[PDB]
Amino acid sequence: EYPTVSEIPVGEVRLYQIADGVWSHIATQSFDGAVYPSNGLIVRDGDELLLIDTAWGAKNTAALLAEIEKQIGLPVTRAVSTHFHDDRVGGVDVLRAAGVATYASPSTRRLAEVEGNEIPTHSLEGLSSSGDAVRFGPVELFYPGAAHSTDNLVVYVPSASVLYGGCAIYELSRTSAGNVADADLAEWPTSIERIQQHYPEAQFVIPGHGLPGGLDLLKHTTNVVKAHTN
Numbered sequence: 262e263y264p265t266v267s268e269i270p271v272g273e274v275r276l277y278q279i280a281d282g283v284w285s286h287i288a289t290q291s292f293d294g295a296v297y298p299s300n301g302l303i304v305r306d307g308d309e310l311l312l313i314d315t316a317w318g319a320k321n322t323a324a325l326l327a328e329i330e331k332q333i334g335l336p337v338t339r340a341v342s343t344h345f346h347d348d349r350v351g352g353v354d355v356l357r358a359a360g361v362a363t364y365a366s367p368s369t370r371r372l373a374e375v376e377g378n379e380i381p382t383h384s385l386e387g388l389s390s391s392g393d394a395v396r397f398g399p400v401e402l403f404y405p406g407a408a409h410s411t412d413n414l415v416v417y418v419p420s421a422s423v424l425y426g427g428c429a430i431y432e433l434s435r436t437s438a439g440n441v442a443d444a445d446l447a448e449w450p451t452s453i454e455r456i457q458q459h460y461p462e463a464q465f466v467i468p469g470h471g472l473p474g475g476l477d478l479l480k481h482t483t484n485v486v487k488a489h490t491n
C-alpha cells in the first residue's frame with residue numbers, strides 16, 4: 262500500500278519502491294493549519310542515488326537520508342529540486358552539508374533566493390523553454406511550461422515509465438485548488454497538455470502531494486484548475 266498522510270508522523274519519512282531502482286519518498290508537514298503529505302523520488306544510478314526533491318524541511322530531509330541509508334544503503338550524490346517552494350528546496354542545506362550536489366534550474370534558483378528559501382548550488386542547463394527535455398543521469402528532466410509555478414519541472418524515468426509530476430499534478434482526492442499563489446492558472450492546462458503529449462506512455466504518475474495514479478491525474482488537475490478559474 263502507498264503510505265497516506267494519516268499514517269506518517271510529521272518528522273518521519275517513508276520510502277515506497279515503485280520499480281527496480283525507483284522509489285518515492287513520502288513525508289508530512291504542518292502548513293497553514295493542516296498536515297499535508299509530500300512526495301519526492303529516488304532513482305538508482307549504479308552505485309549512487311539521484312534524489313528528486315527534499316522531504317520538506319531540514320528535519321524531514323535528515324530523516325530522509327537516514328531512511329535511505331537504512332533501507333537502501335547507497336549514497337545520495339545528486340539532488341534536483343523541481344520548483345522553488347519549501348517542500349522542494351527545504352532541506353537543500355542539509356543535503357549540501359552531507360556532500361550531495363544540489364541542482365535546480367536558473368529560474369528555480371533565482372525564485373528560491375528571492376523568496377528566502379534554500380538555494381540549490383548548481384544550475385541545470387537546457388530547460389529554459391517550454392517543452393525542453395534533458396537527460397540527467399538515469400532520468401529525463403522536462404520543463405512543461407508554467408503551471409503550479411513558473412519554474413516547475415517534471416521528471417520521467419524511462420526504465421520504469423514513471424512520471425513524477427511534482428506539484429503541477431494533483432492527486433485524485435484533491436478536488437479544490439490548493440496553493441496557487443505563484444501559479445500561472447491560465448497557462449496551467451496548456452502545460453499539462455504538453456506533458457500528456459510528451460509522455461503518453463506514462464504508466465505510474467506521481468503527484469507532488471498524495472496518491473499516485475495514471476495519466477488521469479492530468480485531466481483531473483485541469484478540471485480542478487478550471488473549476489477554480491471559471
Ligand SMILES: C[C@H](CS)C(=O)N[C@@H](C(=O)O)c1ccc(F)cc1
Nearest residue numbers: 292297346347348428435439440470
Ligand atoms: C507548501 C506546499 C508547497 S507546493 C503547498 O502549498 N502544497 C499545496 C499544493 O501543492 O497546492 C497543497 C495544498 C493542499 C493539499 F491537500 C496538498 C498540497
Ligand SMILES: [Zn+2]
Nearest residue numbers: 306307308309
Ligand atoms: Zn557510479
Ligand SMILES: [Zn+2]
Nearest residue numbers: 344346409428
Ligand atoms: Zn509548490
Ligand SMILES: [Zn+2]
Nearest residue numbers: 348428469470
Ligand atoms: Zn508542493
